[PDB]
Amino acid sequence: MKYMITSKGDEKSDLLRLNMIAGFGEYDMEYDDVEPEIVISIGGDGTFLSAFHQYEERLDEIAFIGIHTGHLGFYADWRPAEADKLVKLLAKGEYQKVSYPLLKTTVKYEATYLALNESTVKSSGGPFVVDVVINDIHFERFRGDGLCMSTPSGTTAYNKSLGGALMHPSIEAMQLTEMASINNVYRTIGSPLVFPKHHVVSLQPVNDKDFQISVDELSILHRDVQEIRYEVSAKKIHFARFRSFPFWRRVHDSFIED
Amino acid sequence: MKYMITSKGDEKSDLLRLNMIAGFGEYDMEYDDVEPEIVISIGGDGTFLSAFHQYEERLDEIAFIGIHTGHLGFYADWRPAEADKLVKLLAKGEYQKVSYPLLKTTVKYEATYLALNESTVKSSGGPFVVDVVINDIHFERFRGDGLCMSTPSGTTAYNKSLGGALMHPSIEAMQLTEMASINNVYRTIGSPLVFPKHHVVSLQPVNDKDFQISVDELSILHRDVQEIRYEVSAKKIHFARFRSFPFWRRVHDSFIED
Amino acid sequence: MKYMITSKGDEKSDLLRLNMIAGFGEYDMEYDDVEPEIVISIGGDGTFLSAFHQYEERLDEIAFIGIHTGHLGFYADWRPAEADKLVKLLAKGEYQKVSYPLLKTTVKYEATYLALNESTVKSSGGPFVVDVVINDIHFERFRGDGLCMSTPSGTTAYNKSLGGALMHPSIEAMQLTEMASINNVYRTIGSPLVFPKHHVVSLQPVNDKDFQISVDELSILHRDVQEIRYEVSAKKIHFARFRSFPFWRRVHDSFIED
Amino acid sequence: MKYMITSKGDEKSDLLRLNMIAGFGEYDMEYDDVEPEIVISIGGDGTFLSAFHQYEERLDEIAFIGIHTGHLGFYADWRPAEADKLVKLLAKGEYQKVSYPLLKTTVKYEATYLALNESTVKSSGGPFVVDVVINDIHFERFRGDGLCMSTPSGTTAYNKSLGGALMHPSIEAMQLTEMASINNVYRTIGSPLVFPKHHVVSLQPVNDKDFQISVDELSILHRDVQEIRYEVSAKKIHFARFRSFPFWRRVHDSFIED
């Protein structure tokens, strides 16, 4: 199986990388960063994010592995010490796969993006106001700092800081949270909302048509936007699992105590 | 088809009830409150709740209808004005059915209950402290006023007042929220948590073994409790649908504007 | 100066107590638990609370000292290791005093109480509903689990768990927070409210006239209540200060890191 | 007494303005927008804000009046219908004055600003990280979207949307709230904080030294910032009062029902 490895860039990560590669040379494993079947990232959740988006157009042909050379991550959940064993197990190709849901974002003026964590919307400076439309029915007029639509695995990220709920990744859904909404004229739901597959959430400008849109780490000022559409993606990300590391165990280690 | 009708008890509801019954006598429809196939409640969401628990041991053999003689409800979503048309449409038995997930609560000292909205736990006076265990792994030690586990349709109820998220009822899940947790010694997740089918959440006493437990409207002081177990029920509640009244439309009418 | 000492009841605290007493016998200091001028409590914030209420009718004639034989407290902010030095410094009577504001609670059917932390209101089971009246003007009708009125120093307690703000004790004020308020029929402010001296907040029953009222640690089911009145007390609690332990330093050590 | 009048710019406000001026010509009242003693703004709270900052260097020599030609404001609390009576009462100079506290913001690289509502800090894009220092003691390291320091009267504004408490303007204080703080590495207080006069809160860069700073409506990207200092201003804003419109009455009308 073809494979490739990305590194955070620091000494510890490049060294760990050149080692796994070496240990990989001891097996039938060709290195290939154009058409890999295995993508290993070494660093943190951020390093994993970039690895995802580098190959987001081949998701169905790749199994991702994430190693953390620092504190435990939610995607980088394997310690460096377990590196040599990752190499061997990946060699047999016996491993099982696990898939997490993704979020499709559409922008019309038409652009499409895939989010592993979330996509957010804010104003280009000045007041942020958008009509919120769910499955073609007007739901509310939002006034505040912005909004956030998150994947299940992305709930432990930005979503969490916004009062969103943590959702188990086996649930195919997306969750919308509010940023500093004004409530008085305007009236928002306040609560976070969790949508199932096929539900389409759409945002529409009331005055300003320029928004700062983000998809995971990349953030662009889109001009003359007419509509932003959110829906659970048909596509999924595929991880290779070699042992049991329960999502809630990962939540606990991360937020309660490790 | 056998049927029965419950009423909030006020004049408007008893009159509406005796009318539907009359209009039902114009069809092949036997009234039966022991083995009904159709259960109509007239009043509010509360009147619907009681109707549910009166027949909770026959859920798979009943289709529920809820009429609101006051403000729109989430289960009582049909206006009195549409009564006569309900009667006719129910007569043909052509109607489609829609199912919402329920919550199974287990209490060991062993008692089992079904919740349409939620189940909560509080102390019998004095400090409330419980160990929270998810799928057999200890997740956190909770200290505060109590906890709340909610069904999808129950998210617009108590859950909502506790910062929980609103979840679409087509998602088979349960959501746990915190009540006034202390954070300093103790450390809780803070965020609400959304669990999929088959996940088992368990609460265990640390000192006091007496808790005030609630399942929907009924609330009992259970003594010498050893464990409380929450999991998505295998059983579902079945509604008869005669037209499109989207859950989010029901959320909007209820909280934003009607 | 006459003095007395209370102890949490455990070995460590009784031993520390009998020591300070001994060291006190080395000075002109008569032990007196009826008319003391110095009240030392040994244990935690709870032990301090009880010491306060034991002598709440002599506040202006007493200076309180709080020692923590466990984790740092907000009132028990002196370590056992500093005991012997407390004894000496208290002997000279040179020490300066520091006063924190208190909360006056009034109950009419007429009873008055003093709170060092807060006073809360909940229903005697069944739904809790009260009209909230500020300075004689109706402000809102509250529906939920209950309400909480807190002193400045009490803000780091229950108040904090309810989303209240932490207020510096030199500010003469009281803060009201909500418990799980329903928002839809009913409409509450949501935000916590901070009132200055002389503002009178009053709660009035809408149906049920029985409430579970708490003042700090003591909690009584009051029957046939007609009104509950909150206002900043004219009376203050007096601490003896021997060195600088800034409130915010105490907040930091307690919640961020010690 | 010299006076001047500002208008939102719409027809209704300019007409109301030219009228009051006319009615003012019927008295001994010279119009002067350079050295006025009375400043009347006509529009909304925003129109009042601009009027404040236009003359912020003469606060002690001016009494402000705010008229709302739309929905009730917190500073624009007089209806157009009461215009002619404002004119007469202001003519006698008998009116009483009322003062609200302000917030002093200091920026070092040194710039000083006055806020009627609040001052906020955010990153110039990229992650926002600042050390929070209270009265020279390090309190916490903040990681998130930003922070907000609010005056008492400003609590009903941005502060409110951030979970801050509403504070009565007679209390000389400032309140700090968090924007989407991450909690896991980093650890923040979470709670809002209310500081008394003389307390100095300081923010300091950890990496990036560029921040988007706002003072009320104006928002500037400051570069190479070394410190931002917040403290209750010595200066106060002075309103002319002609009758009783209680702050809490203004809170109620605005958020509960008018």
Ligand SMILES: NC[C@H]1O[C@@H](n2c(Br)nc3c(N)ncnc32)[C@H](O)[C@@H]1O
């Ligand atoms: N593991 C904690 C660190 O990883 C970043 N992070 C990313 Br990128 N995605 C997530 C994520 N999905 N959950 C938690 N943290 C995440 C998060 O911003 C923090 O810096």
Ligand SMILES: NC[C@H]1O[C@@H](n2c(Br)nc3c(N)ncnc32)[C@H](O)[C@@H]1O
């Ligand atoms: N920049 C990489 C990641 O940072 C996460 N994030 C952002 Br952006 N802002 C916040 C934030 N304020 N709190 C927690 N996580 C955040 C967000 O999940 C994104 O994928």
Ligand SMILES: NC[C@H]1O[C@@H](n2c(Br)nc3c(N)ncnc32)[C@H](O)[C@@H]1O
């Ligand atoms: N329709 C609003 C009214 O119905 C009660 N209620 C019940 Br009972 N269940 C729900 C529910 N699931 N969602 C919203 N409100 C509910 C809720 O407590 C309120 O009194």
Ligand SMILES: NC[C@H]1O[C@@H](n2c(Br)nc3c(N)ncnc32)[C@H](O)[C@@H]1O
């Ligand atoms: N008593 C009937 C219903 O009341 C709902 N409920 C309760 Br109990 N307390 C609250 C509450 N505090 N806020 C909102 N809903 C609530 C809860 O959903 C329950 O099913």
Ligand SMILES: NC[C@H]1O[C@@H](n2c(Br)nc3c(N)ncnc32)[C@H](O)[C@@H]1O
């Ligand atoms: N010091 C933390 C411990 O002391 C209790 N406590 C009391 Br009693 N009063 C306060 C208080 N005012 N602030 C913080 N904790 C308090 C609080 O409930 C916790 O058990």
Ligand SMILES: NC[C@H]1O[C@@H](n2c(Br)nc3c(N)ncnc32)[C@H](O)[C@@H]1O
């Ligand atoms: N029982 C002694 C003290 O406990 C505090 N308290 C209570 Br009661 N409930 C909570 C709570 N749920 N969270 C934090 N503090 C609390 C409250 O401040 C009281 O003075």
Ligand SMILES: NC[C@H]1O[C@@H](n2c(Br)nc3c(N)ncnc32)[C@H](O)[C@@H]1O
């Ligand atoms: N009266 C409500 C309107 O006035 C704006 N506003 C301003 Br500007 N300052 C305040 C303020 N201090 N309180 C409430 N709203 C305010 C607030 O942003 C909203 O647009």
Ligand SMILES: NC[C@H]1O[C@@H](n2c(Br)nc3c(N)ncnc32)[C@H](O)[C@@H]1O
């Ligand atoms: N722009 C004029 C006023 O708007 C207020 N404000 C801002 Br900026 N953002 C928000 C916001 N997100 N919610 C409520 N008020 C806000 C803030 O109080 C400021 O003085």
